[PDB]
């Protein structure tokens, strides 16, 4: 504490102003924590066991990312599913109906089908999300159309960099998907593309490892990274954003403006200490 003799209204106002910002930051963190409550409290041990109980074959992809956040009950990426269920019939909307029927018999639980996945709701309320896959492995999504991404490499990157982020990458991705889900459907990036952008955004992340700090970082990073086709560190493409075109296309520019406006709204909401503006971002 001592300086050894080594030597106000503005300073007082500046100090109170900063304290206000620091208090608001903790308040928004509670908002994010509540939004992430179902994911963070999910009994992943029970999800893994029940996957073995219900299970034409399950993929070797360890995901268990099925907890919903921010009331967004959508499944559009690997970070939203619990496991892939590879269909063995050599024949996307159809392979989902297979997985739905076979499990309805094996199960104890009511099985349902959605826009992209199969939801097994057990008696206690647990909803496990199963993505139907086909072997050639590919995953759905553009309805009635299979995706081109490699499901294994996405799972490897998601888990590795989620582990490198103390399991906070997927919470940040789920909050980002909640922010983007409130935009027009045609002005929304794909769930797989968001996950690839988050991998690229957090591989060399030096900032604070909290969802509150990571979420603005994703949109700040992705508004630039979306301008160029997605690649890994080798430079090899990951084949997730071919639907946007070539580098600096009009589509990628339009996505850059939107990703930048969501980031500005986040900064403005925090600077305005506006809790309702932050809640409006999540719906």
């Amino acid at each position: 504490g001592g300086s050894g003799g080594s030597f106000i209204s503005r300073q007082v106002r500046d100090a109170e102003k900063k304290l206000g910002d620091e208090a608001f930051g903790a308040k928004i963190a509670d908002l994010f924590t509540g939004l992430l409550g179902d994911y963070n409290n999910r009994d992943t041990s029970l999800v893994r066991q029940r996957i073995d109980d219900m299970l034409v074959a399950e993929g070797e992809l360890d995901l268990v990312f099925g907890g919903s956040v921010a009331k967004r009950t959508y499944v559009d990426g690997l970070s939203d599913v619990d496991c892939l269920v590879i269909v063995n019939d050599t024949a996307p909307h159809a392979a989902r109906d297979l997985v739905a029927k076979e499990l309805a018999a094996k199960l104890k639980a009511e099985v349902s089908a959605g826009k992209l996945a199969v939801t097994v709701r057990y008696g206690d309320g647990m909803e496990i999300q199963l993505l139907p896959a086909v072997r050639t492995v590919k995953i759905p999504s553009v309805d009635g159309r299979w995706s081109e991404i490699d499901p294994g490499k996405f799972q490897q990157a998601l888990t590795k960099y989620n582990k490198a982020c103390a399991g906070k990458l997927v919470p940040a991705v789920k909050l980002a998907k909640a922010v983007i889900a409130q935009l027009p459907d045609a002005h929304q990036l794909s769930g797989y593309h968001i996950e690839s952008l988050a991998i690229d955004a957090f591989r060399n992340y030096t900032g604070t490892m909290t969802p509150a700090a990571m979420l603005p970082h994703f949109f700040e990073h992705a508004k630039e990274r979306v301008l160029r086709p997605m690649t890994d560190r080798t430079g090899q493409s990951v084949h997730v954003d071919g639907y946007m075109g070539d580098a600096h296309s009009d589509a990628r520019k339009t996505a850059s403006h939107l990703l930048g406006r969501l980031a500005k709204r986040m900064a403005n909401a925090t600077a305005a200490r506006s809790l309702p503006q932050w809640e409006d971002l999540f719906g």
């Binding site: 001592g2 050894g4 030597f7 007082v12 100090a15 620091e22 903790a26 308040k27 604070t208 909290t210």
Partner: protein, 181 residues
Amino acid sequence: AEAAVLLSGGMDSAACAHMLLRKGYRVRGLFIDFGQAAVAPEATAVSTLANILGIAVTTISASAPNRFGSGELVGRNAFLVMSGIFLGGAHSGLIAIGIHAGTPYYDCSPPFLSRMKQVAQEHTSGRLDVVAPLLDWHKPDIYSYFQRSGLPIEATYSCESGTIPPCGSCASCRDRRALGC
């Protein structure tokens, strides 16, 4: 918002507690008895200042083979913050430390605060933040605020040697001498 203030008995942390109370926050105090030489006069000062401010103080004790005296004690301020979190129950809101500028100590510097902020935030998903309102102030600025606080200077104690009367030669005593305090 809730605020836990690390109190040492000096003007700096007392000024912090007054500021947080003046902002309307729910404020409580934390005193750490780690065997420092000035533990007895510091504890008395903390009890008196807290009783005037109307805040409760949790006393956290720690002991190990040491001969703590005056001067820098490596890791002290980061240990006081981590003690307030782990042992003082400061898991949400703000935890305040009265560090300021002009000292020779790294753990009074802005880089120290930025790291402590990250540590507290990352352990609580941001629900807890470390705050140091006097970070860029020097002791004459703090003395001016303390004169506006209404708190009694006679109840404060800052000598790192623990002697009554103060030793007069430690860095904190020479702060007081340069301020006529």
